[PDB]
Amino acid sequence: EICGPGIDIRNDYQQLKRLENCTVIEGYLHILLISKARSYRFPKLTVITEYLLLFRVAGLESLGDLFPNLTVIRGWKLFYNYALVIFEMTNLKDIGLYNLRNITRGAIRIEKNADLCYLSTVDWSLILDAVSNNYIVGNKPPKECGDLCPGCEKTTINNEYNYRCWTTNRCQKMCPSTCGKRACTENNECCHPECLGSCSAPDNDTACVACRHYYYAGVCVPACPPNTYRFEGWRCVDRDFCANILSAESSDSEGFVIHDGECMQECPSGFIRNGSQSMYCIPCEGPCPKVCEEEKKTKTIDSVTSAQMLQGCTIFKGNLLINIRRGNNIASELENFMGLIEVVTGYVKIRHSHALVSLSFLKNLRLILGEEQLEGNYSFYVLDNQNLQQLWDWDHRNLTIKAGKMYFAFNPKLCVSEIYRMEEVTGTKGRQSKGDINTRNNGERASCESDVLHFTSTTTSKNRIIITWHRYRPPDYRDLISFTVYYKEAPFKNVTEYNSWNMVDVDLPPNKDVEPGILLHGLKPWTQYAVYVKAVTLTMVENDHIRGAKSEILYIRTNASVPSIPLDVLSASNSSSQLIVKWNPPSLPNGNLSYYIVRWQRQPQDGYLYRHNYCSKDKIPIRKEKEEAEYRKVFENFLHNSIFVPREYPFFESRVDNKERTVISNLRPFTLYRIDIHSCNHEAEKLGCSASNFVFARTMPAEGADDIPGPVTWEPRPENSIFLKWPEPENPNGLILMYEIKYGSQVEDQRECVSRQEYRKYGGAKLNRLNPGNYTARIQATSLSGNGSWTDPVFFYVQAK
Amino acid sequence: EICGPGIDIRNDYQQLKRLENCTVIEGYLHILLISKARSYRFPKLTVITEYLLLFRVAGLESLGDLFPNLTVIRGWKLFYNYALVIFEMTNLKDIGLYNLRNITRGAIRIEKNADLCYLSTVDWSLILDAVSNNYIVGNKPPKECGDLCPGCEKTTINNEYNYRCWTTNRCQKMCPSTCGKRACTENNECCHPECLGSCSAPDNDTACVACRHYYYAGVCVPACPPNTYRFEGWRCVDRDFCANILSAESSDSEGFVIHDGECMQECPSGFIRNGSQSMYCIPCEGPCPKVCEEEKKTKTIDSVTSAQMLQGCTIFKGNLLINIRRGNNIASELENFMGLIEVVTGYVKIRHSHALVSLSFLKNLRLILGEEQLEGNYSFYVLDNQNLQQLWDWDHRNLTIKAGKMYFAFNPKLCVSEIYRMEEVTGTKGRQSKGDINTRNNGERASCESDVLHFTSTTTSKNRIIITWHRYRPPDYRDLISFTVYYKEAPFKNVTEYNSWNMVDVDLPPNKDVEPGILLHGLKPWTQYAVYVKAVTLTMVENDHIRGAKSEILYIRTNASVPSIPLDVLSASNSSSQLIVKWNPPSLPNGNLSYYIVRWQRQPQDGYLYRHNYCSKDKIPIRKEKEEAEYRKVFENFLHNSIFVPREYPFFESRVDNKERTVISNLRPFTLYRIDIHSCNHEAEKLGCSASNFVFARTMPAEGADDIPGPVTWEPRPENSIFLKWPEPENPNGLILMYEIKYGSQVEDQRECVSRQEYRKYGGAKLNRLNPGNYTARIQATSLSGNGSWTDPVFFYVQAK
Ligand SMILES: *[C@@H]1O[C@H](CO)[C@@H](O[C@@H]2O[C@H](CO)[C@@H](O)[C@H](O)[C@H]2NC(C)=O)[C@H](O)[C@H]1NC(C)=O
Ligand SMILES: *[C@@H]1O[C@H](CO)[C@@H](O[C@@H]2O[C@H](CO)[C@@H](O)[C@H](O)[C@H]2NC(C)=O)[C@H](O)[C@H]1NC(C)=O
Ligand SMILES: *[C@@H]1O[C@H](CO)[C@@H](O[C@@H]2O[C@H](CO)[C@@H](O)[C@H](O)[C@H]2NC(C)=O)[C@H](O)[C@H]1NC(C)=O
Ligand SMILES: *[C@@H]1O[C@H](CO)[C@@H](O[C@@H]2O[C@H](CO)[C@@H](O)[C@H](O)[C@H]2NC(C)=O)[C@H](O)[C@H]1NC(C)=O
Ligand SMILES: *[C@@H]1O[C@H](CO)[C@@H](O)[C@H](O)[C@H]1NC(C)=O
Ligand SMILES: *[C@@H]1O[C@H](CO)[C@@H](O)[C@H](O)[C@H]1NC(C)=O
Ligand SMILES: *[C@@H]1O[C@H](CO)[C@@H](O)[C@H](O)[C@H]1NC(C)=O
Ligand SMILES: *[C@@H]1O[C@H](CO)[C@@H](O)[C@H](O)[C@H]1NC(C)=O
Ligand SMILES: *[C@@H]1O[C@H](CO)[C@@H](O)[C@H](O)[C@H]1NC(C)=O
Ligand SMILES: *[C@@H]1O[C@H](CO)[C@@H](O)[C@H](O)[C@H]1NC(C)=O
Ligand SMILES: *[C@@H]1O[C@H](CO)[C@@H](O)[C@H](O)[C@H]1NC(C)=O
Ligand SMILES: *[C@@H]1O[C@H](CO)[C@@H](O)[C@H](O)[C@H]1NC(C)=O
């Protein structure tokens, strides 16, 4: 008995009766807002695909009271990456799912259960996989609970080992070590590899509580038989089953598809249904066509959300009504949704679209039919567009209106010639009436043919640009003339005319010998700016020949400057005599980075250190709201007055020509290094390369270099004394601070500390006044990185004579 | 020798010579980017007002090498709340300022000094005050340093006590305990209370290294003498000194002012200079006038940053040139800067200001003179404003143009009547020429007198509004008529016409018996919306009488709905039988909150707990990227299908009529409580009050309620046994889990555990088979909150007979 494709039980506590016969729940399960007021127990349920959710169920004390035999929660579809959600469950004392074995996908969210115990008593690491992403907060604190399993087994949690159980009467069932990844029966006999959870009988396909791969005819098959297909994620159905499945009712709702041996709702991305609503998907070349079908016969695009419904459509079975009064970046936003619409089965009406200066956002639209036409047989109908300068009718575009006429009225900024060129490609020359296209109220303010403004000279700095164009006499002697400079930051040249354009109005100079120009104030160094000037011809005599002047879009890049310091210098040592160091490109390069120049200087071993007698110390040293961005900016501004011109310890200098990583070679092991890193550019040979962002790093210690390189010698001396002599390590890791002699008669119990200064005087150490007998001794040098290895024992005797 | 008002030594290491004679540095001190290559030592310097900054000084090993006698850094003005910044100082080993005593204001920033030791050896808690906000990161790690003071005193850092010193040769100077807040000489004789730091001689005004209040004539005065004034924050100067001080050169730079006995740069907020540039400030009523003076004779307002310079000005000594092509919210942003400008000494030119539909942002502007006028004697000159519908010339405003004419041209949306009404208040009737104001190219598209659209019916839901207005026959029979509905969320009624307005175009219905209306889709419940309809009259016959239709701004509020759950319920217990609980108003009230309704239910003491024998246990219980907002939203949507209609343990119910806080009375001490909190509204008596956001809280334990209420009695029993009998605590804190008997012959060494179930059987405990002798015994009850007090000893004997 499969139940689905989704159970949502809420409010009525009696509504839980829908689970009387369900053994598997295909899809999620929701038990919400239940107020229990006899009990309900469902031992039939064992498997739940997708997730299980519980929320605000009053009266329920344990989950075992409802689903005691629940074994596998597949989590095929998750509730926000959660396969089990127990949230705000009052009166609930424990997760009584003592038969739960495997949660195949997702995490667990257990939250806000003031009486929920037996949380730490469950080893979730063996029932699910992603234990790290589990969410168990806000439950009953373990300090005030009292978990006590009846009296079973136990295992390791972190470094702790404690008992495991689900409730106060049942323990956590586990499988023996011999089955490995397989499952086991209650009697601990291994279950068939394709099984999952428990077994009605050991090693049998038809005796499984839940299959781990797929299910068909009572058998746990790895893959579906040849004539069956994967449905959901656990069972196999035949072809006649998915020909009867229907998706959620929508405007373009259809049946399910068979693809890649799976029976899914829609064809996946990059696939389209073969034939006419057939059951199979065919690979579609490049972009796959999505025909959009809507209930409303005339789709009205009056906002930005209305256009979102036409996103990615290739053909529109309906009528388009554009009505866009407001909108700033809609010219490029509509092109995201409607830029792929190619065919319109009906008519297109551009009414009251004051925000549209052009129709270029309707790219790829090459076919308009005329299945339904506006009153009077019209397939293209624009009206009252106070800013429509041009159509999408560039001479590159293609268009074909099958049937209908075109009506144009009250579009003042649209040149009347542009709509005569439309019916050329449209193919409706002479099909319209005499009033459909009228020079009155259309093209009244249109400035069609314009002149050309020619730039004359440009001068660049690192932040200023001076540009001058030729004087422009207006077409009529009586026109008042003024200019308007449009300039904006354009990283590359493909620029559309006015938009985040910066505008300034400069007047024609009074003296006729000087030409009009403009000075730009504060610009970023080495930045390409798109500039073009436009004339303002206020004609006292209107129309006759409305004539403006426009210049070409000139791209001017400012000069380069001193670069910024490299960002976040990090360094490590993977080996002695080697230093790796990485960084990030500077904040303001101001040109082409070209290369980096890095310098490393040896640092002296710390002053003093040689001076102190480290046999007296107890610790010997070793070695291996928020406006702070404005604070650090002040110190970056200081680094402009000092640059770096490239060419006691000396600096070594190397150029890194491409990457932001480099490895330094030939270094003294366990020595500190000052790593100066600069950033130059292509103009840094005259501007000077940038300042330095430096870091300090120490290399790895030379292994085995701080131990005694020779044998220990001994010489008897006055009293009952012995003088141990040993060679000094030539190249220690940093510096040898002290030696330790470990000697004794039977056990090397007596220990003698030999300071560095003591060894420099005598070349060894004198063991003072020993008891007679046979002795052994071991010596160990301690450097700055650490100690070396003990020497092999030296043997000396003190005679009692 | 006072040096200032700011020393900035950088780059040139020889430039440090400017401190040869300075004993006090008035203002900050900057030593940056220095590269030392003989040494420089300045024992003269002792005091530094404001802060001291050091950055990237190579070669310097200790700060004592430069300023050994530096005693007081006043920090009058801070470098971002820092009085001392030592950042990226290479080769620096220690802060050698061994004479530093008091840092009066600010924190310390010591960062990125890889060789800086002697940081933990300094007790900064006695030289500065805000030790919490200090920043000491990125220096030499204390593990690899080796701080060793020569060989002085020591004190407590946190819970540690260690030696204090500045460098390897000098220690941290401190003052004896007898001086308290006062200062001390090197020889530990207390310094005059007005002194600070050290003393040339004990207890003398003229023998101070630094005064703590102020300084004058070699004396540390608390306040300045009557004829002197506070300058900076340490010395007193006479009146003739501040009459010679000049601020930083600006467009309106003047001398300093004397105010409140202090000599400051400008008059403080709420004060203006008396007379004509005098030395004293006078209280100005309400808003204080700020006359703005600029070098550029004609200020050009062509952007949003240019207007920021005119912020708060009352009078403008110059000419205003408005040229605003772009800008959305500039109509209300310009009113922030220019809304207080009242008088303009020159002319005003509104050129190419297409973004301006009105000049209302120039509020309070009531006077325009004419000191300089545009060519042709013009004081008001507008030109080419394609959207200027009206001036700021409301009949409420006042204006007076002293001299000059007014020229109007190429303003199409400006009604020609509006500028005739201007020269009424302006007072220039007949002063202009015949071409200065022309009906041509002015008012060409202006729709002056308009009709009135009347609403007919409105219907409201919780998210939808239907509104219908009367049918409108256009003035001309041949006009095409359409409507445009403007509606936007308006919390209150003061609304300006079109702006974040939502617009939709509805057509006049074909049937003449039905009136035009519109249905609004998804609105917030209980929200006031401003709605008004506007007619679109496309006149086939242009002008004659351009006539539009506009409606009144109708304010419609939607219905109320079920409120949201209260936010973040927190609860605590300040006393037994009392529970305080606070919360936050719901996310979506949907009406007037009116009141809250809270419920508290007693929770039963945990099941079991009574069952276990807690004398065997070892621990007895006690008690006292980020889309999770979308996750929690799903659970808030679930709480709409279940509401609360207001009226084993019973629920107690109380109404909170105003605040979001309440205190529950009459409770059982140390008992858990379920606190259900709902949020109602004025319509919740029919809609139903909202769901509950509940919390659990336990009250305080009843003090002394879990101890024995009577004396202990003993009775001899068979063997050598004793049966101790004691009364049970009537009202324990939660529950008595176990008793402990502490008995012995000479010392109460033997301890007997008495479980709760054992006491229920016998009413006491039997001490089993004791050795003969005299005994004492003490008993203690352990409840859920904790243990009670031991009983006074009971005395019993075991005879050996
Ligand atoms: C629950 O069962 C599933 C499926 O039987 C287990 O999923 C395995 O996940 C690992 C992860 O690398 C894959 O390599 C295996 O191939 C998966 N199994 C199969 C049959 O494909 C999952 O590990 C099980 N979880 C627990 C806790 O036992
Ligand atoms: C900005 O770059 C231009 C070149 O793109 C510089 O003009 C050059 O200036 C040098 C002066 O050292 C002359 O020798 C060259 O002949 C100039 N080249 C051209 C094409 O004019 C200009 O000087 C740079 N700006 C600054 C401030 O250095
Ligand atoms: C350094 O000296 C100043 C001024 O002498 C001290 O400032 C005192 O701050 C407390 C804070 O509550 C005030 O109550 C006192 O009135 C201030 N002193 C005076 C004279 O007004 C500051 O505490 C001193 N810092 C150290 C570390 O001694
Ligand atoms: C929204 O509020 C209006 C009143 O402002 C409601 O209109 C009332 O509806 C009740 C129905 O129970 C009638 O008894 C009243 O006479 C109506 N008053 C008016 C002034 O018309 C309207 O029903 C509310 N909307 C909803 C969905 O309940
Ligand atoms: C469940 O099975 C019973 C028989 O035991 C049957 O009467 C009933 O109709 C089935 N379905 C439901 C929803 O109870
Ligand atoms: C211009 O071209 C570049 C690269 O071809 C592209 O990244 C950018 O989006 C284009 N911009 C426009 C406005 O076409
Ligand atoms: C900077 O780099 C770009 C990209 O490779 C290149 O086109 C340009 O010529 C370079 N500029 C110079 C001055 O080499
Ligand atoms: C340091 O001493 C320990 C002590 O036995 C030794 O194991 C270790 O090898 C020594 N270090 C080196 C580098 O030999
Ligand atoms: C500092 O004092 C000396 C006298 O010791 C004098 O010669 C010099 O001019 C003064 N000023 C400076 C800046 O050195
Ligand atoms: C409307 O008035 C309210 C209160 O008087 C005020 O907070 C708000 O800013 C005003 N808005 C406008 C546009 O005047
Ligand atoms: C809601 O509160 C406001 C503010 O006090 C008040 O003006 C309004 O009348 C109230 N509404 C009702 C229905 O009482
Ligand atoms: C709990 O026992 C300690 C042990 O002496 C005692 O000091 C304390 O007062 C006891 N608690 C109470 C509430 O009496």
Side-chain angles (χ1 to χ4, degrees), chain A residues 10-11 30 32-33 53-56 79-82 85 87-88 90-91 109 111 114-115 135 140-141 143-146 148 168 296 302 323 325-326 328 349 351-352 381 383-384 386 407 410 441 444-445 480 482-484 486 498-501 503-505 507 521 536 538-540 565 603 606 608-609 612 617 621-623 627-628 630-632 634-635 638-639 641-642 674 691-694 696 698 784, chain B residues 10-11 30 32-33 53 55-56 79-82 85 87-88 90-91 109 111 114-115 135 140-141 143-146 148 168 296 302 323 325-326 328 349 351-352 381 383-384 386 407 410 441 444-445 480 482-484 486 498-501 503-505 507 521 536 538-540 565 603 606 608-609 612 617 621-623 627-628 630-632 634-635 638-639 641-642 674 691-694 696 698 784:
Chain A
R10 65 179 61 193
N11 293 96
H30 287 185
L32 280 59
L33 309 181
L53 201 155
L54 298 149
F55 176 68
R56 294 221 186 187
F79 187 91
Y80 298 153
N81 303 330
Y82 294 115
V85 179
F87 181 48
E88 280 202 317
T90 180
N91 301 123
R109 179 126 184 178
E111 189 179 12
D115 289 53
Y135 195 85
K140 196 174 194 181
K143 40 199 171 186
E144 181 54 70
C145 165
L148 177 57
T168 179
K296 302 178 181 180
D302 64 333
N323 185 90
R325 293 181 176 268
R326 195 173 164 84
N328 192 22
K349 184 174 182 181
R351 172 195 60 185
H352 299 329
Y381 193 103
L383 180 61
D384 191 26
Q386 289 200 233
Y407 180 80
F410 288 82
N441 68 66
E444 183 176 350
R445 296 193 300 271
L480 195 152
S482 183
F483 295 96
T484 300
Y486 297 78
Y498 187 91
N499 287 270
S500 63
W501 281 90
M503 296 162 293
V504 62
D505 288 332
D507 299 329
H521 285 76
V536 184
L538 296 184
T539 61
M540 296 266 295
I565 54 176
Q603 284 302 100
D606 283 335
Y608 272 37
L609 202 73
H612 300 165
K617 314 297 181 181
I622 51 181
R623 179 65 169 87
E627 57 185 358
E628 292 186 352
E630 175 174 72
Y631 170 87
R632 293 180 176 86
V634 185
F635 292 88
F638 289 143
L639 296 175
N641 268 16
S642 294
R674 158 93 167 277
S692 56
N693 180 25
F694 58 93
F696 284 96
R698 184 184 303 268
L784 196 62
Chain B
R10 65 179 61 193
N11 293 96
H30 287 185
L32 280 59
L33 309 181
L53 201 155
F55 176 68
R56 294 221 186 187
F79 187 91
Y80 298 153
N81 303 330
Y82 294 115
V85 179
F87 181 48
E88 280 202 317
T90 180
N91 301 123
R109 179 126 184 178
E111 189 179 12
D115 289 53
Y135 195 85
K140 196 174 194 181
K143 40 199 171 186
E144 181 54 70
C145 165
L148 177 57
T168 179
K296 302 178 181 180
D302 64 333
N323 185 90
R325 293 181 176 268
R326 195 173 164 84
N328 192 22
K349 184 174 182 181
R351 172 195 60 185
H352 299 329
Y381 193 103
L383 180 61
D384 191 26
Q386 289 200 233
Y407 180 80
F410 288 82
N441 68 66
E444 183 176 350
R445 296 193 300 271
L480 195 152
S482 183
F483 295 96
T484 300
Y486 297 78
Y498 187 91
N499 287 270
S500 63
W501 281 90
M503 296 162 293
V504 62
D505 288 332
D507 299 329
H521 285 76
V536 184
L538 296 184
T539 61
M540 296 266 295
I565 54 176
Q603 284 302 100
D606 283 335
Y608 272 37
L609 202 73
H612 300 165
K617 314 297 181 181
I622 51 181
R623 179 65 169 87
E627 57 185 358
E628 292 186 352
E630 175 174 72
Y631 170 87
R632 293 180 176 86
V634 185
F635 292 88
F638 289 143
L639 296 175
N641 268 16
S642 294
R674 158 93 167 277
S692 56
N693 180 25
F694 58 93
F696 284 96
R698 184 184 303 268
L784 196 62

Side-chain angles (χ1 to χ4, degrees), chain B residues 378-674:
Chain B
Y378 294 98
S379 187
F380 199 85
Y381 193 103
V382 304
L383 180 61
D384 191 26
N385 306 278
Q386 289 200 233
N387 293 276
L388 198 56
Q389 294 180 344
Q390 67 180 13
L391 295 84
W392 61 281
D393 181 29
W394 288 70
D395 282 20
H396 309 72
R397 293 298 306 273
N398 195 332
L399 174 61
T400 297
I401 289 185
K402 189 266 175 183
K405 296 187 298 297
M406 303 184 304
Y407 180 80
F408 293 74
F410 288 82
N411 307 309
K413 280 298 182 178
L414 210 171
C415 276
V416 69
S417 63
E418 202 79 7
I419 67 192
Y420 297 137
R421 316 304 169 91
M422 186 193 187
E423 56 183 359
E424 297 178 346
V425 185
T426 297
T428 58
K429 47 180 181 181
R431 266 165 62 174
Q432 289 79 15
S433 175
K434 306 174 183 178
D436 297 11
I437 289 87
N438 61 326
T439 70
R440 293 173 280 261
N441 68 66
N442 277 11
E444 183 176 350
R445 296 193 300 271
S447 61
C448 312
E449 299 290 349
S450 59
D451 291 334
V452 180
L453 290 168
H454 299 90
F455 291 129
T456 314
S457 64
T458 64
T459 310
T460 59
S461 285
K462 66 175 183 178
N463 37 25
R464 314 175 196 266
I465 299 184
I466 290 185
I467 180 173
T468 58
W469 53 100
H470 193 272
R471 296 187 65 97
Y472 179 70
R473 302 296 162 176
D476 193 288
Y477 295 91
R478 304 174 180 178
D479 293 353
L480 195 152
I481 176 62
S482 183
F483 295 96
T484 300
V485 182
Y486 297 78
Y487 70 98
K488 78 171 182 179
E489 184 171 338
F492 207 56
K493 311 177 169 177
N494 47 323
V495 174
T496 66
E497 294 82 0
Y498 187 91
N499 287 270
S500 63
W501 281 90
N502 290 272
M503 296 162 293
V504 62
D505 288 332
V506 59
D507 299 329
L508 186 67
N511 183 263
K512 301 178 181 178
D513 289 325
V514 300
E515 53 184 0
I518 188 59
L519 163 66
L520 305 182
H521 285 76
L523 280 55
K524 300 173 175 58
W526 191 270
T527 305
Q528 191 177 55
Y529 289 88
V531 183
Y532 72 92
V533 295
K534 185 193 299 181
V536 184
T537 58
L538 296 184
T539 61
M540 296 266 295
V541 187
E542 191 266 341
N543 196 333
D544 302 337
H545 264 61
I546 308 182
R547 212 184 193 98
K550 191 171 185 174
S551 177
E552 68 168 5
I553 302 180
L554 175 58
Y555 301 109
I556 312 178
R557 182 183 297 276
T558 61
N559 289 87
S561 60
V562 172
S564 176
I565 54 176
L567 294 181
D568 310 324
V569 174
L570 305 182
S571 52
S573 187
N574 292 327
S575 169
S576 58
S577 301
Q578 280 188 354
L579 267 175
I580 70 105
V581 47
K582 58 184 179 182
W583 58 93
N584 298 327
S587 181
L588 310 179
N590 302 339
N592 282 339
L593 291 172
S594 295
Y595 61 87
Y596 292 82
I597 177 79
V598 298
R599 300 194 306 163
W600 56 97
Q601 183 192 35
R602 289 186 49 179
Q603 284 302 100
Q605 298 294 345
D606 283 335
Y608 272 37
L609 202 73
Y610 298 71
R611 175 184 178 270
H612 300 165
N613 190 290
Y614 287 87
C615 281
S616 306
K617 314 297 181 181
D618 188 77
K619 292 248 182 177
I620 45 184
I622 51 181
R623 179 65 169 87
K624 288 187 175 181
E625 276 288 72
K626 187 167 187 174
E627 57 185 358
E628 292 186 352
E630 175 174 72
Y631 170 87
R632 293 180 176 86
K633 175 196 174 184
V634 185
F635 292 88
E636 267 196 349
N637 301 333
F638 289 143
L639 296 175
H640 270 248
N641 268 16
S642 294
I643 59 181
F644 176 78
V645 184
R647 292 296 179 88
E648 288 294 324
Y649 269 104
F651 267 95
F652 290 159
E653 206 162 329
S654 70
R655 262 190 278 260
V656 184
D657 265 335
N658 191 84
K659 308 176 183 179
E660 285 78 13
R661 296 168 175 257
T662 179
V663 186
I664 306 180
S665 60
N666 300 16
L667 309 170
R668 204 159 185 173
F670 202 81
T671 51
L672 196 65
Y673 276 85
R674 158 93 167 277

Side-chain angles (χ1 to χ4, degrees), chain A residues 194-212:
Chain A
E194 280 291 336
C195 211
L196 181 58
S198 172
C199 282
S200 310
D203 196 80
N204 200 23
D205 291 333
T206 58
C208 280
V209 182
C211 305
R212 62 172 60 251

Side-chain angles (χ1 to χ4, degrees), chain B residues 669-687:
Chain B
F670 202 81
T671 51
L672 196 65
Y673 276 85
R674 158 93 167 277
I675 301 181
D676 276 25
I677 297 188
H678 312 72
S679 60
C680 314
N681 53 23
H682 62 276
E683 283 297 274
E685 295 182 342
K686 187 178 181 180
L687 285 160

Side-chain angles (χ1 to χ4, degrees), chain A residues 604-615:
Chain A
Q605 298 294 345
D606 283 335
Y608 272 37
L609 202 73
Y610 298 71
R611 175 184 178 270
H612 300 165
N613 190 290
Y614 287 87
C615 281

